């Protein structure tokens, strides 16, 4: 694994940039909180600072890129408990009908401060949309989590 692939590095950049809202290279509690709220959580300031402290190896009070890689390494992997993707799916499936619509996905992107065209939203849906109905059902959401 000596070196990463560029596709891997790009994925990590994607992830980090989502949280680093102003693009300055560091994630603050303000930014962490703002994004978490968009994605369905409601952490307190103290909770956010505890999250930073766990991975703030240089003690400077904010999270840089390698610190963020460590944060993902510790919180994610996969495994362990699992099966509350239903809550994850619900952050998208805002009306609970079993299908993430284009308007629902745009709502999430709008909470995050992004303004997407219909084509860009459809492009996102095509990552998971096996049956071509322009929506992501739970089964499709589950498949997308284990694929590629």
């Amino acid at each position: 694994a000596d070196q990463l692939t560029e596709e891997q590095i790009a994925e990590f950049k994607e992830a980090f940039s989502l949280f680093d809202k102003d693009g300055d290279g560091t994630i603050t509690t303000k930014e962490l909180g703002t994004v978490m709220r968009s994605l369905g959580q409601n952490p307190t300031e103290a909770e956010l600072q505890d999250m930073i402290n766990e991975v703030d190896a240089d003690g400077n009070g904010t999270i840089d890129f390698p610190e963020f890689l460590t944060m993902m390494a510790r919180k994610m992997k996969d495994t362990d408990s699992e099966e509350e993707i239903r809550e994850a799916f619900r952050v998208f499936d805002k009306d609970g009908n079993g299908y993430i619509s284009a308007a629902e996905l745009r709502h999430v992107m709008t909470n995050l401060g992004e303004k997407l065209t219909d084509e860009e939203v459809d492009e996102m849906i095509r990552e998971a949309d096996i049956d071509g109905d322009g929506q992501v059902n739970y089964e499709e959401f589950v498949q997308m989590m284990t694929a590629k």
Partner: peptide, 20 residues
């Protein structure tokens, strides 16, 4: 810029950060 898969991963990540 962010893809749907990575966004759903970020939703999951946000939940794990809360102890869920």
């Amino acid at each position: 810029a962010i893809g749907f898969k990575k966004l759903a991963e970020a939703v999951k990540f946000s939940a794990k950060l809360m102890g869920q």
